[model samples]
Target: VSLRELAEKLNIYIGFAAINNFWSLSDAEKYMEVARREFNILTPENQMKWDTIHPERDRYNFTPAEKHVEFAEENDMIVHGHTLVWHNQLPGWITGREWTKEELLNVLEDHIKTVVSHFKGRVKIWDVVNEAVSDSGTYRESVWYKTIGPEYIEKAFRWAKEADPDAILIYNDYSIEEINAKSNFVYNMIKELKEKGVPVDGIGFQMHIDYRGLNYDSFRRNLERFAKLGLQIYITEMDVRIPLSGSEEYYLKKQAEVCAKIFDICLDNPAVKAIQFWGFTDKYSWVPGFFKGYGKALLFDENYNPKPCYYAIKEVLEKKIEER
Candidate 1:
């Protein structure tokens, strides 16, 4: 189902990517079309990353990003920047350089301030920090940690707030569901941040689960715990991939059931502010590429047709007459 159709039916909002295309004109146009017709909020995947937006020092490129923002503006869609600081997929130029801690901090500050200020009013939400926590509840070791330690996360959020105080800033991560060690890590991090008076406003749970790995009860419990922090909760990058091999009808039905269950859980929990499929269709999904055999993991099939999963999700949302 289209994001707009799903959002309207559920009485909720929808979000999708802008730069997940990696600057391809054809892909960007397709995304624009979907946002124009289906989605109310546009989330650019690559444009908000350090690798694509700022490949070189003091050299920021917005040509590709501008295309996304232009489309969102023309269609009256809300814009959400995917991320500002992350541990992985960062440019080598930023990580490879050998600089003093002070130098690296300066660069980090500059990047956040310039990018956030540029789209201060246009972008409604900013993922200030992404995947900074580990499963064991300690800060993940990345170039940012090696250079500036755990304090980098607070620095990024502070700088983003300074640049665009109006923008809703979020700390996003994977594996933040339930009794898992990762969830504990994230929970503690947020609690510590809040107690310290950090300018954080939200938390994003990147729901990238597999059929066998999913545990709905745990997912709901974790969201409830996070909500106690008085922060908005967003189900960002949602996808459920299954192992390949089976009759099309059989496997597709299984996928649909998975979607229905997850959506039902989210619908029952009012803390979930938004739910975004990582990609609209299975063909464009990163699953096949990331996992050689496991693909067809999204609501739409390759042809952009609604799959069984699409209807399953619809049923869950429609079951509730009004948003609680």
Candidate 2:
């Protein structure tokens, strides 16, 4: 009686973010039971990131990342590499080194190529370059941009392609679910990449939104335009946060409403292929960890029980099945 059964009815993936030690914990039946029974896709929350895998200059660690892929396969789930390049959580070794354009380009190329090739067929999609554009519609001032410039993006995609010709490369970002300056920047960048025939195959919209900020109309419009770019669209990291100011019962219901609205809109566009929550439970959610008191941003609670949002998701997916 998990949502995976309902998800099969929609022919789309309902994915979840998994902690690095998820597969290693023996006392995690409650966690893994739901994961095994419900979700169809898995994104290693941090194990596959640069700091974890490439902590030093001349080395790489594939143990955790590889185990994640194996666990996903054992459970009949798809593995999506969380990221190949990102601004934060980068290795101190790389960030500390002073480098020329050629040197930094080599670093970027090696990371993408080596990692992508290692998990080629196992990992179906990659956030090839994540959060590259800032909310101000300009490239973020990360080490990649500071040293290698915007061309670093093009090189990243190209190298990923060279390493694993069959893998789907994606550009993932957040706070661009509307037709504004930021969204415009992302759209234009992807358009340019597409026209040039870069190996970019998808766009991951990290839909970290809330009830107050929920604008289904604006998001659907944005998805429609991005779809026209001839790239796959995925709601990569989805969660609706309940504000601390609201009543407990009321906020829970509103969270469910937000989940329903998101799926309803996804049904409108054929390009929308998958929906992934940031984490399956509110207990492990990064919201509270990162933002002090505001939390309860997932379908389940700390004890691994379904919250109102879980029922909301189940209701919508089952509703879609009934309509069909």
Candidate 3:
């Protein structure tokens, strides 16, 4: 059976980050064929980002983002609005000019409302604010935080909630997979905001780890801590990077083990609702371009064939399905 089928049986979403340009490739059908059979959820990797969706102050581009929703609808899949507020990939209009606190707040509110309202029903889960916290456990002084202070986060979530009350708003970040400085900061932030009746509904752990894998016990404990606050957890943008340092067979086998361990951890956690790879195939992975020497970091290989990691994940899902 497909991974999507197995995940559906468990009432969990198996998703992958999809790029709009990939659909125009010569092998687009092959790419889509795998996506349809293996995943039930789609997260637009770049289409929904500020620079791509709202390129100019007066004009908003919905064409590329709409394609993602349309594809998901046709395939009977769900869409996860990647991010509404982030420090990176912001449009020039937002970053190039200076503005008063109120003005920026209104701009931010308008952006959130317009984007969320456009896909209110189709995109149910949104990473409303992304990577606001740094590894030092301090709020990154992005334009949002610098001008509006930390309240920008709350305002973003509040605006998104106002736009689409039913959408599951998530605070997404990377390197917070375990109980550490960054994760602790996010935990405390979420707890405090939740106490204040913030509409934040979930935490997105961008599980971008290397072959060394995670401290399984620590990861579980971290999720349990957040689960107590009654917030859903999503393992978002997961990709286990592998260095081309050894024999391909040996490294791939290690990658399989790591991928399986991740699945097992998510499966055992009740609060964890979804696990989405940044990209399913290594052919289009953004790893090599960013991290030199690390490449094969996805379930599928360069040629669109399932790798050992794919079967490893499937094995974990199958075992879970059989246990029930």
Candidate 4:
């Protein structure tokens, strides 16, 4: 059975970030078909990013965004938008020059409201702010932070909720899979926001792990700690880096071990409503390009074939089904 079928059986969502415009062409359609057959939730990998959809200050290109939403709807997947506020890949027009606090705040709110309102009914969740905290456990010095201070994040969430009250607002960050200073900061910040009645509904941990010395129990504990906050916890953007410490076969098997454990941990946790891979295959992954020497951080091989990681998760999830 396909992963989508298996995920349905488990009463869970296994999703992927849609990397390309996969439905409008022939070869592309086949590539997207794998995702369609497997994943229950769809997130635009980069198309919904600020630079992609709203590159210019006033020019909001809704065609690609519309197509992404339509693709999710047609395929019966939940349309989960990638992000609203992020420091990287911002529009030049928006960040090319300095702005006063009032000007910057106005534009930021407008961007959130416009994009959220446009996808109000179609999208289910918007990562309201992404990677806003540094690894040092402090807020990153983005234009939003530099100009408008910490209030920018709170305002963005409020504006998004105002735009689409029904849509879920999320704060997504990476390198937070452990209960370190960074994770603690995120937990306390989210808790503060929730206590003050902010519209934050979920937290996303982009569980990009290296297949070396990672504490799976620590990951699970951190996950539970966040879940105890009564907020939806999404294992979003999961991928374990297959290290060069071993041969290809050895590393793939190693990757599979961690992948299986990840499946078990997230599946057993009721607070984790969704588990998503950044991308599903090594062929189109961003790992190599982004990390230079590091790559092969997905479930499938270059030819859309299942890797050992894929079979490992399949076996675990399958066994879980049998036990149930």
Best by TM-score: 3
Give Cα distance to truth, residue 307, candidate 1, Å: 0.5
What's the C-alpha lDDT at position 184 in model 1?
87
User: Model 1, 53-123: lDDT tens per residue?
Assistant: 89888688877787778777888777879788887777878767786789889989999999999998998
After superposition on all C-alphas, the RMSD of every candidate to the true structure, in Å, is 2.3, 1.3, 0.8, 1.5
Candidate 4 whole-model C-alpha lDDT, 0 to 1? 0.85
lDDT agreement with native, every candidate: 0.78, 0.86, 0.92, 0.85
Query: What does the lDDT read for residue 56 in candidate 1?
Result: 83
Q: Residue 258 in candidate 3 has what lDDT? A: 93
The model with the greatest lDDT is 3
Using TM-score as the measure, name the better of candidate 2 and candidate 3. 3
TM-score of each: 0.92, 0.97, 0.99, 0.96
Candidate 4 clashes between residue pairs 3 or more apart in a chain or in different chains: none
Candidate ranking (TM-score, best to worst): 3, 2, 4, 1
Model 4, which residues run further than 4 Å from truth?
24-26, 244-246
Model 2 CA deviation exceeding 4 Å by range: none
